[PDB]
Amino acid sequence: MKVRPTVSSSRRKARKAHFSAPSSVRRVIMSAPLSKELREKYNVRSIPIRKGDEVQIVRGAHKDKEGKVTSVYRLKYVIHVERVTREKATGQTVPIGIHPSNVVITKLHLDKDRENILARIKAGREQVAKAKGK
Amino acid sequence: RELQKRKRRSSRPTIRMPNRRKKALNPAGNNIIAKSWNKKETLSQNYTRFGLVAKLGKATGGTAPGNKALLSESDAVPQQQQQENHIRQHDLELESKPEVLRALEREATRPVEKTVRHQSEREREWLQRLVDKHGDDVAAMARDRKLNPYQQTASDIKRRLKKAGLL
Amino acid sequence: SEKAGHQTSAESWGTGRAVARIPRVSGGGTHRAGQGAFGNMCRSGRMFAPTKIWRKWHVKINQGQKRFATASALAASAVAPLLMARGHQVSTVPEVPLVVDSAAVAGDAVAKTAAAYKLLKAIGAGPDVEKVKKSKKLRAGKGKMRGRRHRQRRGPLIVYSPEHDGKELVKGFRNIPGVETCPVDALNLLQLAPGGHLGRFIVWTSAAIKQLDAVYESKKGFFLPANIVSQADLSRLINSTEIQSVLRAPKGEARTKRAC
Amino acid sequence: HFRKHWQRRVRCHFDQPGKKVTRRLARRAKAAALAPRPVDKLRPIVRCPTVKYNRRTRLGRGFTLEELKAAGIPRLLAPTIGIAVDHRRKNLSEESLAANVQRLKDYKARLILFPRK
RNA sequence: AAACUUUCAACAACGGAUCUCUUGGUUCUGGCAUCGAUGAAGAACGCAGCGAAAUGCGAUAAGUAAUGUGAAUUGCAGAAUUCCGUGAAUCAUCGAAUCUUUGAACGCACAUUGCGCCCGCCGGUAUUCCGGCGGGCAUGCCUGUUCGAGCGUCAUUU
RNA sequence: UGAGCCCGGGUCGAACGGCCUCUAGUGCAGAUCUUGGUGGUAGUAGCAAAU
RNA sequence: GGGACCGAGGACCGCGCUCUGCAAGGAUGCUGGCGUAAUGGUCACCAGCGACCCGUCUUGAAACACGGACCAAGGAGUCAAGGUUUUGCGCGAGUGUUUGGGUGUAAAACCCGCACGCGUAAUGAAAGUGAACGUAGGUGAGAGCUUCGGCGCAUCAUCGACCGAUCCUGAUGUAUUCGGAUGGAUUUGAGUAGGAGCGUUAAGCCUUGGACCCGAAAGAUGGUGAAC
RNA sequence: UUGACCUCGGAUCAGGUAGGAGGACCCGCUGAACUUAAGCAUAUCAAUAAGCGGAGGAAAAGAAACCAACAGGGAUUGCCCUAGUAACGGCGAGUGAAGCGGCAACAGCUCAAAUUUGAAAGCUGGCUUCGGCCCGCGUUGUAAUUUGGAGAGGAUGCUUUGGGCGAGGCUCCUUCUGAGUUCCCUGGAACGGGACGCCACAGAGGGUGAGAGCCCCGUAUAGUUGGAAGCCAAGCCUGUGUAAAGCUCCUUCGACGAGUCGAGUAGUUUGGGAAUGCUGCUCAAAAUGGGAGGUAAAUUUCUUCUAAAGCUAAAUACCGGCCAGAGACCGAUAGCGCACAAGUAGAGUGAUCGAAAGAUGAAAAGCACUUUGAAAAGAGGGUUAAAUAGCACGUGAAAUUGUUGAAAGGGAAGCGCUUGUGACCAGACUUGCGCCCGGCGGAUCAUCCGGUGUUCUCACCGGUGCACUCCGCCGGGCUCAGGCCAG
């Protein structure tokens, strides 16, 4: 149950906020799970998707298929990963869109910012686990 | 109405005003009340736990049970039965209980520095000139024009000399 | 809206033409020009008897009647078959008032919902909790567009004593679907008789039961009402030795034979 | 009395619980600033004026200057220690004076006064 | 017997009712007080690759600066544009700028991208000619500054 | 009896129904009713206006 | 003797009779037929008999008159305040928390300190006065009870009793001009003669609001153009 | 001749200010008519709408020339009752307050009238290293003191102080903070059903190819990272001048608002001709004064305040402004005129008037290619779970229309009762128990044994076997039972 006055449990405002979000807010919405090896390595649940993440699809008709993310189409809330293509009438292969909630991240594209992202998550996950424990 | 329809069509952000109030709802600081104030409780059960009184008026409704926060002779004079031409004017001479109340009496009756007031350098020089000439006869210092130009009463100089230490 | 249906400039065409005497929109350069206006029968017109905010929404009920209906809802909760007739899965609890000891609820023993769930499963409220969980269905109608998406059932009602048990058990029972918590000083008829149907399954606490005699002795202007009957069992009234000794002989039978 | 346009001057009170919680937060914010202090001021016991209400007393506006002097409370210190002063009211009787002086001595006994700085 | 006409059924039309949906309205409640001569509200002209609509912006023109996030924008044409980086973005924030003509509208006129004055600069034969640019030039009133008038009025032989 | 109600066959794609209570912007053949759609007149009048 | 239509009810009970059971308070017995169709439904059409086109309005009535090309959707006694009657409910000589305060799981629910509204004694224009002489009375009815002797609800009839006011009579007395006691009236009361009200729910009616829905000519305020 | 002071002007001199917008709420000015009284004019509507002027987050009012008659109360404002009372009226329609009482919130002050006169102590400029220089304003009065339930002046003896830093705190933005994508089925897609789990101070909401607590954003509590501006603030440096302040006493004083009040008159307004208030006009005050009340009480006895100067938060209002949260509301002929190009398209000289119009699919995968021909069109072929979902796009009613089929039709059809003919469609009692014999297996069968739960005498397991009993099963034989219609 909500208790704070600044949060609204309104279907009208929530669907408005989701479909009219700017690109920075759309980045957090298109977040993906980490794989079980990656969870036990960095103690991270989920991060937003980049352009260089090797990923495995777990939902849909392209299940059990692995590939590298080619583009992050934030406008239609969908990503394109490598080699999942569908042929048009002319034979031109157009990429098939997969939601980031339908995939699981196998390899990350690491830089200075991504390490800072993952260190901030494992900071708070350990801090409250210590707080819950002792 | 035409205002609000323009904003929906516009690619400009809706300026979200944070919930700021004029008056703070809770006490703050490093005083006794601020440390023992409970945010979740209300005024009456806070002052219950402190041991104080919030309202001095007549009770305007039913209160919660156990809050304790809302409160011979010859000449026939009723004032004489109540007794115990100037009074002290900047302070009042005053003659199993909650901890916050026990603290509040402790800083109430703690000893306070006097912070005495001194006379100026010219004032003690004015008196030092006066005592050397006349002496301990305060009457002659009152009626002497050259060392008492402000023509002050001998009782005032006597009181001023006592503050300097000279008799 | 008060201005709805009549922010339009229209006038009747009179008896000059063979059209219905309705206000018709002036002008001649649009699709709107010439159409009827201001009628409840007219499209884009004002509705008959517009709804106003000064309708009486709240009704005043006597405090004596409210305290009567709460005491009746309390008594129906102590009656066993009224609980299973309301819908509660009461087939495992070993007593219908079903007091739990305060030591198992008070303090921080229940403030985590894993211990709140364990306490309910042990005392017999387990089927009632799962009944609410397994009954979550989408709402039939148009209230799902108005913020009322799902409907589930009502589980047990926690009743405690805030002075003795504390207020930390509200957090424990808050997220279990169906179970509700109420202090013994502020009992609610909307919770005690949901839907107007008596017999809410109430789990009590040992501190809440000693308090319950005190809170009904402290309501001013209200005493516990005396029933107009002393014994509510009709079969004890009629099939008694006192009444049957002075009765006449029967004049007939339940089945009456056809003479002709 | 529906002779005028009653529809354009009708006031409804759907904010009655909303004004109540706003009123309680104003009293809450008043004791936030005045934390050891009470939220109100001392008012004298006053006798209602007319013959219908002669036999009932109520809270008045402030204490007489003679009532402050008999209780030993200075007049220019009284508003600073939470006592309301009214220079318009007069005693006119010893019973009104004795009742309010006794009230001020009771306030004096219950009072905790703090030393300046 | 066909045609035509009526009734019924199957299939095909016309039309948009019914069911379902809703980035909309309506009503209530709560926190707060913020337009303009430092040029507002409104009107107009322009600014993009393909811009038709809408939105944003002002010749610094779908925008510049600064801060934060951290790798897009996207219907098609982009770059050697940036990826352990002061750094993508039709991103967010926003404290610095730019801000054409009008409009209370302010040198005069206004339906013309016209007609004057004071100060300064630039280019083209150039101290003389021409064109352009920059800062100025409304009314009433207040305080001060400065200038002027009045046998209004005072002093002026020590 | 009736207002109505249940089932079969086809179509169709995401929500809906019974009971007991509460509620109301709650039941249409007419109002030269309102809005929309569509007829006979009629492939007729006639080629005027509009397109 | 011949024919038709019908078989309601479902252990026994009753009245009877020609008494080892019958025709006596309502049909049994026997035999046959029925699944590539017993028996139904809907549509189209034929046949016999029947049978004015609906609504509104006028009138004793018809006859006129108004509306109806067709289909879908919309579409007309509503909501407030104040009265009044009745039903239910809570408490009851009282009743009503919800202006407000306390409180809260936060517009919900729960609690109430003081006043206030209506009621709990009336009458007279007024000064003002003010409910018992009789088990608050007698008598007769009267539901109910009964030790069968009598008690007697509510209510009514009559004879009474008292009080407010009016018209009288006029006591001790009294400030020397104040009083109403006692005794009366073919008097009046929306009087007493032992309380019934307050809050609420449902329905109905009355009044006012747009007031069941639709439908003038007018008048007024403020603007825009320029004239029959 | 010079130089003032006074008054009136100029300057493209320096420094500022006003206009316009908005106007839901607020303060003023001005001001209708329709209606009602079953006609209508007083009245009402209404001190309203329209018109004009002027502010703020509130405005306005406000610290008594008050209310009262009491044992008095005590600035203003708003709620409840007072109360449909008093009061006024074609006494009809009607109109219509206030004091008291209960609450909400409360807070008090500044001048003018005084001689600083042992010292204009005050203030605007513009020139500066900023530390302090001049110019002007002003004595026709700028500071200090004082503002009538007061005060001043002396005396008197106690009691009070002032600045500058300031750690830190509160408010608000911010970063992070729980648990299944485990197995099977259907399905284009699992967010569905079954099994096994987990989190929950989070089972609000939303998205994801169908109903997701555990896929994602968020959601709950406490912390935690960085930032903005206000306010508070433990402490620490400092002060100072015979400087300011509160009282007490008294052989000393105590100034309180004029074309205002009031008398007469005209208008307007009010419940209110003690004129209810206000405005204009004529006349025009007082100082043990003046205002308003009470009272037959014996003369205006008494009570209560002090007008003509001024400021002031809160409780109050709000169809507007910056946001935010909700609903027993409406769901595309509804709800705002506008879910979408909406004050748009369009009309009118102009003021103004003012619409219609939502839905492919999970994803454009929006039909490549072959082939008729001039097209908003077909036939093949393909995409898709589905194209009779093909940007005429969810579902796709009726009116109305075409084709095919059946029947009928001599100057109306339609309808009621009852057959009949033909066409199409449906399918009638679910269609069973009991005995006998023989075999086989079980038990609720053995005074068989061990165990578990329990309402403590009932159930449920495990192992024994078939003396008895009872169930089934298989193979025979037998019995009766039945639904509808006839004779």
Side-chain angles (χ1 to χ4, degrees):
Chain A
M1 215 40 250
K2 110 161 168 158
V3 315
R4 286 166 67 237
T6 186
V7 46
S8 100
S9 66
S10 165
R11 169 171 197 100
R12 193 163 144 190
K13 289 146 146 160
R15 289 177 39 82
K16 184 153 211 283
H18 179 264
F19 292 128
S20 98
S23 300
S24 46
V25 187
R26 290 171 108 92
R27 182 190 103 107
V28 191
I29 296 172
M30 314 174 60
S31 308
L34 273 77
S35 57
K36 293 341 164 314
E37 199 278 327
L38 282 192
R39 289 217 185 159
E40 254 67 37
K41 161 136 155 294
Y42 279 142
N43 204 347
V44 179
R45 273 300 200 150
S46 54
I47 59 160
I49 272 285
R50 252 193 72 98
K51 205 202 166 19
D53 287 350
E54 308 279 337
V55 79
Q56 179 211 71
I57 310 174
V58 298
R59 277 301 188 276
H62 303 301
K63 198 151 149 205
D64 293 343
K65 224 172 291 183
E66 219 273 347
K68 149 176 34 56
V69 168
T70 65
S71 66
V72 187
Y73 225 124
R74 285 164 162 175
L75 203 43
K76 28 187 61 50
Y77 272 124
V78 87
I79 70 171
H80 297 331
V81 316
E82 185 65 35
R83 238 168 312 281
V84 293
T85 51
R86 148 138 185 103
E87 254 200 354
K88 283 225 293 185
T90 73
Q92 178 177 0
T93 89
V94 278
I96 316 180
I98 312 112
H99 209 267
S101 64
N102 277 352
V103 302
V104 66
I105 289 184
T106 287
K107 199 203 288 164
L108 281 74
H109 181 270
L110 295 199
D111 48 358
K112 267 260 157 192
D113 282 325
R114 270 264 171 110
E115 289 149 1
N116 288 8
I117 289 167
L118 266 69
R120 284 191 291 161
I121 290 181
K122 102 159 296 308
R125 292 246 310 181
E126 278 55 358
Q127 184 256 329
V128 177
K130 289 296 187 291
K132 171 197 51 61
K134 67 181 176 66
Chain B
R1 192 64 204 94
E2 254 80 10
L3 215 80
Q4 316 306 129
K5 285 164 36 198
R6 210 217 169 280
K7 305 172 151 143
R8 224 181 60 91
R9 262 183 308 110
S10 67
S11 69
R12 269 207 278 256
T14 71
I15 285 315
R16 221 175 318 194
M17 280 317 288
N19 325 83
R20 283 172 178 135
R21 333 175 72 99
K22 273 155 162 262
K23 291 138 152 296
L25 270 42
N26 303 322
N30 40 5
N31 35 284
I32 312 296
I33 305 298
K35 259 105 77 171
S36 50
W37 183 266
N38 197 349
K39 223 151 307 305
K40 299 187 178 142
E41 299 180 322
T42 189
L43 210 184
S44 311
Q45 36 213 16
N46 271 288
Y47 273 46
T48 280
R49 203 169 37 84
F50 297 159
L52 304 174
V53 152
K55 278 223 113 157
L56 270 91
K58 149 197 179 248
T60 301
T63 69
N67 65 304
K68 347 290 207 309
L70 303 213
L71 183 55
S72 80
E73 147 197 2
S74 34
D75 322 316
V77 280
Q79 282 327 110
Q80 164 260 31
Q81 289 163 293
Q82 274 166 3
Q83 266 173 342
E84 56 189 356
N85 195 337
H86 91 283
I87 38 175
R88 158 198 301 278
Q89 304 265 59
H90 304 85
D91 209 356
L92 261 173
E93 297 150 331
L94 260 305
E95 311 174 29
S96 57
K97 45 186 219 212
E99 336 184 35
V100 193
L101 185 48
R102 291 204 252 109
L104 281 186
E105 330 216 355
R106 214 189 310 298
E107 289 96 314
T109 80
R110 93 164 138 93
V112 201
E113 202 178 21
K114 282 185 183 177
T115 314
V116 291
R117 183 158 218 101
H118 64 268
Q119 316 168 277
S120 75
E121 211 166 50
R122 275 190 83 200
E123 196 186 320
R124 50 208 45 248
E125 282 293 325
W126 166 68
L127 288 160
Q128 193 42 268
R129 270 176 339 103
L130 254 175
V131 56
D132 291 353
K133 203 263 161 194
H134 288 292
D136 38 55
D137 158 15
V138 286
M141 331 168 43
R143 284 180 299 76
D144 157 55
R145 295 271 312 288
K146 90 214 286 313
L147 321 155
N148 185 196
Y150 293 151
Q151 283 189 81
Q152 316 213 307
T153 291
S155 72
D156 179 63
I157 312 169
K158 178 166 270 313
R159 164 161 61 280
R160 205 149 302 206
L161 276 170
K162 279 222 194 189
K163 271 198 43 63
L166 324 172
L167 308 178
Chain C
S1 162
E2 331 97 339
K3 220 193 168 99
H6 69 75
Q7 49 197 331
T8 285
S9 147
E11 258 265 13
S12 190
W13 280 4
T15 165
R17 280 105 145 99
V19 278
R21 285 117 65 214
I22 213 55
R24 308 197 163 275
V25 179
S26 37
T30 191
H31 182 264
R32 193 57 173 105
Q35 304 190 4
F38 306 135
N40 52 319
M41 85 284 290
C42 282
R43 180 200 186 266
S44 75
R46 154 201 51 90
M47 93 177 200
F48 160 72
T51 45
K52 324 293 259 173
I53 50 172
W54 54 80
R55 185 215 296 260
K56 194 152 41 83
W57 320 88
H58 306 73
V59 301
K60 179 211 206 257
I61 323 192
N62 294 38
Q63 224 198 355
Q65 304 220 71
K66 265 143 93 162
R67 289 158 166 173
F68 210 128
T70 293
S72 297
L74 263 303
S77 69
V79 158
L82 282 177
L83 259 66
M84 41 195 88
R86 218 203 76 86
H88 294 302
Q89 279 319 105
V90 179
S91 68
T92 279
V93 308
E95 209 138 346
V96 69
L98 182 88
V99 288
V100 200
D101 46 347
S102 318
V105 201
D108 306 336
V110 175
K112 288 206 59 183
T113 88
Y117 206 65
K118 274 173 53 45
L119 179 77
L120 288 177
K121 290 193 103 26
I123 63 176
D128 218 36
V129 166
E130 218 35 66
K131 179 211 66 179
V132 180
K133 197 157 211 315
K134 250 163 23 172
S135 96
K136 198 220 193 54
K137 298 206 151 271
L138 199 83
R139 170 182 293 272
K142 225 170 295 156
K144 27 188 289 205
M145 321 175 47
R146 310 230 216 282
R148 308 178 294 263
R149 202 94 170 121
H150 306 278
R151 315 183 50 173
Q152 27 184 60
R153 308 278 82 80
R154 300 285 205 105
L157 174 63
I158 313 312
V159 170
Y160 65 109
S161 186
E163 309 325 343
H164 298 105
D165 305 334
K167 244 178 153 179
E168 281 318 75
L169 60 106
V170 202
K171 311 265 143 181
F173 294 113
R174 194 161 41 171
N175 214 48
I176 315 174
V179 304
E180 296 169 50
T181 326
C182 190
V184 83
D185 313 325
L187 288 180
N188 199 322
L189 187 62
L190 295 160
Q191 278 159 86
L192 288 167
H197 307 331
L198 307 146
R200 179 74 180 266
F201 179 38
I202 306 168
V203 282
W204 293 81
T205 60
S206 66
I209 274 282
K210 331 206 197 299
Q211 283 264 290
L212 191 62
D213 261 317
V215 316
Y216 266 99
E217 252 315 314
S218 99
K219 276 146 178 214
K220 98 191 197 160
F222 183 80
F223 43 90
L224 262 198
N227 197 9
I228 62 156
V229 313
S230 306
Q231 166 94 341
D233 193 328
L234 217 32
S235 197
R236 165 80 180 81
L237 275 154
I238 283 140
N239 319 265
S240 34
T241 309
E242 311 96 0
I243 277 189
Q244 299 273 330
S245 60
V246 301
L247 284 197
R248 293 180 280 204
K251 264 160 186 168
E253 316 206 327
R255 215 55 64 86
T256 289
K257 201 225 312 185
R258 317 215 281 147
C260 183
Chain D
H1 269 74
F2 293 85
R3 186 49 185 163
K4 310 177 202 179
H5 212 294
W6 71 289
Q7 272 169 3
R8 76 160 54 102
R9 269 161 327 249
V10 48
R11 170 168 296 118
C12 289
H13 281 283
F14 301 117
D15 47 327
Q16 179 183 23
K19 297 261 227 328
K20 174 148 176 154
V21 60
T22 300
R23 253 145 35 208
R24 301 198 64 227
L25 289 195
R27 292 183 266 251
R28 178 103 178 217
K30 186 147 164 151
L34 328 169
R37 275 163 288 255
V39 84
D40 213 20
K41 309 220 158 303
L42 198 73
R43 309 274 146 145
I45 289 305
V46 120
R47 189 147 303 263
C48 299
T50 206
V51 76
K52 177 145 139 183
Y53 303 95
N54 258 16
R55 342 204 167 171
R56 198 170 43 111
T57 36
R58 57 163 160 96
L59 274 198
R61 184 195 176 75
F63 286 87
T64 322
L65 271 43
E66 270 179 351
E67 272 156 353
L68 289 183
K69 215 224 178 167
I73 270 166
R75 177 214 94 250
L76 221 70
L77 176 74
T80 68
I81 60 196
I83 302 168
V85 202
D86 185 25
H87 69 295
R88 275 177 226 103
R89 201 170 53 92
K90 270 143 313 140
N91 294 305
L92 251 71
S93 67
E94 296 272 357
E95 297 104 336
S96 66
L97 167 92
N100 276 320
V101 167
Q102 173 64 30
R103 195 173 212 265
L104 278 166
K105 313 272 291 293
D106 290 336
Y107 184 81
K108 193 173 176 182
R110 218 97 76 84
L111 191 63
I112 306 191
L113 202 39
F114 280 15
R116 284 281 311 191
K117 55 205 166 304

